[PDB]
Design a protein around this ligand. Structure first.
Ligand SMILES: C[C@](O)(CS(=O)(=O)c1ccc(F)cc1)C(=O)Nc1ccc(C#N)c(C(F)(F)F)c1
Lengths: 240, 8
């Protein structure tokens, strides 16, 4: 059970946005809390990562990129979880102090990606998604986005990824289920893409609509996010 | 160099 012993142990506890649920919902109110939460969650995604099984294999640059590349898609996924486990997919549980409704979904001008994300959370329930299945699916996602130029140490990565999936074969132990899980893992990317698009654009227009970006998130959005959007850095899909 | 590589 070791591999799960790990993931359970290292699983970061849910973090808050510090958002003001007394103040009215507005676009700028909402989107200065999701950039702060993103940075907060990222800080938990770094810790989490470093302690993963065999992740200190990799060239420190590949360690770093892969996180910046897979950061959005992960966050969604544990929101996929958090929304499902806490609110039964009626609402989005980005955090305890920033659970999203339809009004917020619209005020945030993120409505589409947001339906998509509830649908995900719905598919968490539809499909009997267990927590161990959740941890190794979430673990997997870290290794779900590469330069098609490949990595500096691409061989370690190829093999590392092979094992995290082997771990996901065993959590099921049959092939019927895999297809769906995979299929789901695959349903993360289009979203993380759409968001990445919105984020990007939002950064670009940030000075004009009164929305606050953390000195660090702007880097990732301006330097690493765009490699994804230009097609230099692709998702690894299971299907099609 | 970069802020994300610094923190790491
Ligand atoms: C709008 C944004 O703040 C952008 S960001 O957090 O700075 C960000 C910057 C770079 C990335 F690669 C991913 C996200 C964002 O997506 N925030 C955010 C915060 C928390 C959660 C959660 N949970 C999510 C989402 F993934 F669930 F949408 C999104």
């Amino acid at each position: 059970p070791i591999f799960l012993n790990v993931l359970e142990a290292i699983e970061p506890g849910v973090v808050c946005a510090g958002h003001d649920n007394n103040q009215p919902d507005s676009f700028a109110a909402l989107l200065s809390s999701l950039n702060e939460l993103g940075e907060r969650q990222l800080v938990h995604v770094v810790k989490w990562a470093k302690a993963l099984p065999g992740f200190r294999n990799l060239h420190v640059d590949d360690q770093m990129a892969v996180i910046q590349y897979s950061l959005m898609g992960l966050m969604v996924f544990a929101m996929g979880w958090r929304s499902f486990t806490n609110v039964n997919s009626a609402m989005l549980y980005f955090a305890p102090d920033l659970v999203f409704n339809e009004y917020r979904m619209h005020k945030s001008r993120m409505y589409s990606q947001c339906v998509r994300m509830r649908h995900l959370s719905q598919e968490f329930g539809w499909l009997q998604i267990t927590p161990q299945e959740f941890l190794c699916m979430k673990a997997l996602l870290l290794f779900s986005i590469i330069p098609v130029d490949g990595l500096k140490n691409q061989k370690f990565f190829d093999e590392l990824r092979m094992n995290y999936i082997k771990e996901l074969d065993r959590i099921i132990a049959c092939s019927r289920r895999f297809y769906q899980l995979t299929k789901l893992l695959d349903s993360v990317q289009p979203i993380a893409r759409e968001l990445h698009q919105f984020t990007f654009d939002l950064l670009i227009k940030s000075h004009m609509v009164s929305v606050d970006f953390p000195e660090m998130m702007a880097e990732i959005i301006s330097v690493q996010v765009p490699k994804i959007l230009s097609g230099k850095v692709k998702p690894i899909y299971f299907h099609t | 160099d970069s802020a994300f590589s610094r923190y790491y």
